[PDB]
Design a protein around this ligand. Structure first.
Ligand SMILES: [Ca+2]
Ligand SMILES: [Ca+2]
Ligand SMILES: [Ca+2]
Ligand SMILES: [Ca+2]
Length: 148
């Protein structure tokens, strides 16, 4: 009773069409290459082959539209969970400097209904901190959120 509407499919065909320059229904390493170069990156042939191999489920050396539909689904699913984590990081990082301090984390925990001492909060930071600055940056934040 669901998965994809005609309209989503139509928009996924538009995207496929940008890459499939000659309209044969497949994207080759060299078509991938033409699109990347247009975006200011010039990958070597070996780099292009690793990107296709990643996506090529049947091993025929090219990406058809079912294969691109699979890819696009995994990717946007992933882009959603990254949006969530970036959003939760910017509410904690009250001054926007890239780093959650102990004062910032304690203030947000109190608005979440948890009145924590500075010792409690220092312990929370200490478990998550990797570079030893006593702040949580985004990388340390994601590594804690995805599992301790
Ligand atoms: Ca093609
Ligand atoms: Ca294939
Ligand atoms: Ca901050
Ligand atoms: Ca740190």
């Amino acid at each position: 009773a669901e998965q994809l509407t005609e309209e989503q499919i139509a928009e996924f065909k538009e995207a496929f069409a940008l890459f499939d320059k000659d309209g044969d229904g497949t994207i080759t390493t060299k078509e991938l290459g033409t699109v990347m170069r247009s975006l200011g990156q010039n990958p070597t042939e070996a780099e292009l082959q690793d990107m296709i191999n990643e996506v090529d489920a049947d091993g025929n050396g090219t990406i058809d539209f079912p294969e691109f539909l699979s890819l696009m689904a995994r990717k946007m699913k992933e882009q959603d969970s990254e949006e969530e984590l970036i959003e939760a990081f910017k509410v904690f990082d009250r001054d926007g400097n890239g780093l959650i301090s102990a004062a910032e984390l304690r203030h947000v925990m109190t608005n979440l209904g948890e009145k924590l001492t500075d010792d409690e909060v220092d312990e929370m930071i200490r478990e998550a901190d990797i570079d030893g600055d006593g702040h949580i940056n985004y990388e340390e934040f994601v590594r804690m959120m995805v599992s301790k």
